Amino acid sequence: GITAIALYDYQAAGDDEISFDPDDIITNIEMIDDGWWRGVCKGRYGLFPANYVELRQ
Amino acid sequence: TAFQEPPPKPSRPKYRPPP
């Protein structure tokens, strides 16, 4: 499906947001908000600040 | 070898109320 990789190390400052390491890439990352994303990091889903993350193509 | 500073935070996403 979809995928993404964190540009830097970020801390999800949200109730429905998860954190992940830069090199730590995740899968199943869809784009709901033009500024925010959502994907599965190590099994669990969450939200990603597009600012510290980038999908893959 | 890449160097980049952290970007600003985006506005919280919109979410409708629960059913």
Curated annotation (Swiss-Prot), chain A:
Residues annotated as domain SH3: 1-57
Domain of life per record: Eukaryota
Changes after translation: Acetylated. Phosphorylated by FER. Phosphorylated in response to FGR activation. Phosphorylation by SRC promotes MYLK binding. Phosphorylated on tyrosine residues in response to CHRM1 activation. Phosphorylated by PTK2/FAK1 in response to cell adhesion. Tyrosine phosphorylation in transformed cells may contribute to cellular growth regulation and transformation. Phosphorylated by PKN2 at both serine and threonine residues in a GTP-bound Rac1-dependent manner in hyaluronan-induced astrocytes and hence down-regulated CTTN ability to associate with filamentous actin.
Tissue spec. comment: Expressed at intercalated disks in the heart (at protein level). Expressed in most tissues, except in B-lymphocytes or plasma cells.
Location within or outside the cell: Cytoplasm, Cytoskeleton; Cell projection, Lamellipodium; Cell projection, Ruffle; Cell projection, Dendrite
Entry domain remark: The SH3 motif may mediate binding to the cytoskeleton.
Summary of subunit composition and partner proteins: Part of a complex composed of NEDD9, AURKA and CTTN; within the complex NEDD9 acts as a scaffold protein and is required for complex formation. Interacts (via N-terminus) with NEDD9. Identified in a complex containing FGFR4, NCAM1, CDH2, PLCG1, FRS2, SRC, SHC1, GAP43 and CTTN. Forms a complex with ABL1 and MYLK. Interacts with SHANK2 and SHANK3 (via its SH3 domain). Interacts with PLXDC2 and SRCIN1. Interacts with SAMSN1 (via SH3 domain). Interacts (via SH3 domain) with ASAP1 (via Pro-rich region). Interacts (via SH3 domain) with DNM2. Interacts with ACTN1. Interacts with FER.
Protein name, UniProt field: Src substrate cortactin
Species of provenance: Mus musculus
Lineage: Eukaryota, Metazoa, Chordata, Craniata, Vertebrata
Span covered, complete protein: 490 to 546 of 546
